[PDB]
């Protein structure tokens, strides 16, 4: 991990419910895990509505 934590008031692009404290304080592994699996949202370009969700 790093001390460089992303703050929610810093206008960072996260879905609702997803707070960056556990994302920045814990590794990037479970960070992408919780984003992709829970919300189904993809930061890369959406070309398929039937995504991993």
PDB file of C-alpha atoms in Angstrom:
ATOM      1  CA  UNK A   1       0.000   0.000   0.000  1.00  0.00           C
ATOM      2  CA  UNK A   2       0.916   3.740  -0.053  1.00  0.00           C
ATOM      3  CA  UNK A   3       0.337   6.836   2.156  1.00  0.00           C
ATOM      4  CA  UNK A   4      -1.045   8.454  -1.050  1.00  0.00           C
ATOM      5  CA  UNK A   5      -4.769   7.906  -0.254  1.00  0.00           C
ATOM      6  CA  UNK A   6      -7.493   9.303  -2.575  1.00  0.00           C
ATOM      7  CA  UNK A   7     -10.018  11.472  -0.630  1.00  0.00           C
ATOM      8  CA  UNK A   8     -13.850  11.284  -1.487  1.00  0.00           C
ATOM      9  CA  UNK A   9     -14.116  15.167  -1.337  1.00  0.00           C
ATOM     10  CA  UNK A  10     -11.289  15.203  -4.011  1.00  0.00           C
ATOM     11  CA  UNK A  11     -13.984  14.523  -6.702  1.00  0.00           C
ATOM     12  CA  UNK A  12     -12.642  11.007  -7.417  1.00  0.00           C
ATOM     13  CA  UNK A  13     -14.769   8.806  -9.762  1.00  0.00           C
ATOM     14  CA  UNK A  14     -16.245   6.085  -7.467  1.00  0.00           C
ATOM     15  CA  UNK A  15     -19.808   4.517  -7.452  1.00  0.00           C
ATOM     16  CA  UNK A  16     -22.158   5.100  -4.460  1.00  0.00           C
ATOM     17  CA  UNK A  17     -21.473   2.916  -1.370  1.00  0.00           C
ATOM     18  CA  UNK A  18     -17.805   2.507  -2.446  1.00  0.00           C
ATOM     19  CA  UNK A  19     -15.625   4.586  -0.047  1.00  0.00           C
ATOM     20  CA  UNK A  20     -11.810   4.960  -0.913  1.00  0.00           C
ATOM     21  CA  UNK A  21     -10.596   4.385   2.729  1.00  0.00           C
ATOM     22  CA  UNK A  22     -10.541   0.537   2.434  1.00  0.00           C
ATOM     23  CA  UNK A  23      -9.424   0.875  -1.257  1.00  0.00           C
ATOM     24  CA  UNK A  24      -6.276   2.925  -0.426  1.00  0.00           C
ATOM     25  CA  UNK A  25      -5.484   1.520   3.086  1.00  0.00           C
ATOM     26  CA  UNK A  26      -5.787  -2.101   1.774  1.00  0.00           C
ATOM     27  CA  UNK A  27      -4.063  -3.452  -1.537  1.00  0.00           C
ATOM     28  CA  UNK A  28      -5.193  -2.766  -5.168  1.00  0.00           C
ATOM     29  CA  UNK A  29      -6.095  -6.503  -5.468  1.00  0.00           C
ATOM     30  CA  UNK A  30      -9.270  -6.427  -3.271  1.00  0.00           C
ATOM     31  CA  UNK A  31      -9.827  -2.796  -4.491  1.00  0.00           C
ATOM     32  CA  UNK A  32     -10.565  -3.897  -8.123  1.00  0.00           C
ATOM     33  CA  UNK A  33     -12.227  -7.092  -6.718  1.00  0.00           C
ATOM     34  CA  UNK A  34     -14.964  -5.111  -4.836  1.00  0.00           C
ATOM     35  CA  UNK A  35     -15.469  -2.563  -7.718  1.00  0.00           C
ATOM     36  CA  UNK A  36     -15.859  -5.047 -10.631  1.00  0.00           C
ATOM     37  CA  UNK A  37     -17.802  -7.797  -8.744  1.00  0.00           C
ATOM     38  CA  UNK A  38     -20.227  -5.636  -6.640  1.00  0.00           C
ATOM     39  CA  UNK A  39     -21.046  -2.762  -9.075  1.00  0.00           C
ATOM     40  CA  UNK A  40     -20.123  -4.433 -12.407  1.00  0.00           C
ATOM     41  CA  UNK A  41     -18.722  -1.054 -13.581  1.00  0.00           C
ATOM     42  CA  UNK A  42     -15.732  -1.104 -15.999  1.00  0.00           C
ATOM     43  CA  UNK A  43     -13.220   1.887 -16.051  1.00  0.00           C
ATOM     44  CA  UNK A  44     -12.213   0.673 -19.710  1.00  0.00           C
ATOM     45  CA  UNK A  45     -14.557   1.545 -22.667  1.00  0.00           C
ATOM     46  CA  UNK A  46     -18.004  -0.212 -22.436  1.00  0.00           C
ATOM     47  CA  UNK A  47     -18.692  -2.212 -25.658  1.00  0.00           C
ATOM     48  CA  UNK A  48     -20.896  -4.890 -23.967  1.00  0.00           C
ATOM     49  CA  UNK A  49     -23.950  -4.197 -21.595  1.00  0.00           C
ATOM     50  CA  UNK A  50     -23.712  -7.894 -20.492  1.00  0.00           C
ATOM     51  CA  UNK A  51     -20.621  -7.234 -18.295  1.00  0.00           C
ATOM     52  CA  UNK A  52     -19.162  -9.147 -15.250  1.00  0.00           C
ATOM     53  CA  UNK A  53     -21.886  -8.305 -12.686  1.00  0.00           C
TER      54      UNK A  53
END
